[PDB]
Structures are given as C-alpha cells and as structure tokens.
A = this chain, B = another copy of it.
C-alpha cells in the first residue's frame, strides 16, 4: 500500500556562484563529460573497446546587462599573454523555497575564452543580454 511517486526537479531552480560570489545568471549549459574511444582489432575476431582520454569542459553562461555591471568583461579583459585568473564555478539545484541544496555541479579552474555583447536591434522590444564562454578542467556532480 501507499505507493510513493517522485517527480524530477524543475530546471529553473538553480543558483550559480563564480569564484566565491553568487551571480544571478539567466542560462547555463555545456556541463558535459566526454571520453574518446580507443579500439583495437585482432585477426581472429577480437574487438577491444576502452575509454580514452577525457576532454576539457566548455561552458557558456548567459545573463542580462544591468547598469554599473561589467564584472564578466573585466574578467575577460584582464588577460595578459597566457596569464589569467582562474576560478571555480558551482551550479546547484535548490528546493522550492531556496533554503536547501539538492544537487551540485562543480567546475574547477574555469577561465574566459569568448564574450558576446548584446545584439543592438532598434526594432526589438526584448532585453539586452550578454554571454560568456569558459574553458575548464573537470566537472563533478555531488548529491547533497
């Protein structure tokens, strides 16, 4: 008796922190893990398939533009040759009230690689939105 049913978490209940500060973002995507496949074949019919080298992480974060707010462009603009400040990102799925954490996506050593300014369209009534693309080392999912 008393069959219990659980539904998946809605995709809009998340919180993003960059470095050690929390930044309200609009969209986060690209938190994928990819492995190459190494194959070896024998003449007698053996076919070996094993995981290969893990690839780097590419993450794109998207948010609107607000007055007196240029932190992302300041981050991308502080690049000198190969020197840049690397930060750890953390995206967490929260409950409805937002007082608890259910799952966490941990991204380590992410630095900016591209910045996209809003498309200024005089014939549109939408909001101006900026985008930034980061390259990181490794992602890890931790259940709280």
Instruction: Identify the A interface with B (CB < 8 A).
Output: 6-12, 14, 16, 25-29, 31-35, 37-40, 44, 47, 49-52, 54, 56, 64-70, 73, 76-77, 79-84, 91, 93-95, 102-103, 105, 111-129, 135, 137, 139-144
When the two chains form their complex, are residues B10 and A125 in contact, meaning their CB atoms are under 8 A apart? yes
Known: A51-B111, A67-B9. A29 touches B95 (CB 8 A): no
Query: Could you tell me the distance in whole angstroms from the C-beta of A116 to the nearest C-beta in chain B?
Result: 5
Query: Could you tell me the distance in whole angstroms from the C-beta of A109 to the nearest C-beta in chain B?
Result: 8
Query: Could you tell me the distance in whole angstroms from the C-beta of A66 to the nearest C-beta in chain B?
Result: 6
Q: How many copies does the complex hold?
A: 4
When the two chains form their complex, are residues A11 and B119 in contact, meaning their CB atoms are under 8 A apart? yes
Query: Could you tell me the distance in whole angstroms from the C-beta of A113 to the nearest C-beta in chain B?
Result: 5
Q: Quick one: closest B residue to A139, CB to CB?
A: B117
B residues near A32, Cβ cutoff 8 Å: 114-117
When the two chains form their complex, are residues A135 and B93 in contact, meaning their CB atoms are under 8 A apart? no
When the two chains form their complex, are residues A8 and B80 in contact, meaning their CB atoms are under 8 A apart? no
Q: Quick one: closest B residue to A34, CB to CB?
A: B114
When the two chains form their complex, are residues A35 and B112 in contact, meaning their CB atoms are under 8 A apart? yes
Task: Kindly identify which residue among B56, B142, B143 contacts A49, using a CB–CB cutoff of 8 Å.
Answer: B56
Q: Quick one: closest B residue to A58, CB to CB?
A: B37
Query: Could you tell me the distance in whole angstroms from the C-beta of A32 to the nearest C-beta in chain B?
Result: 5
Query: Could you tell me the distance in whole angstroms from the C-beta of A43 to the nearest C-beta in chain B?
Result: 9
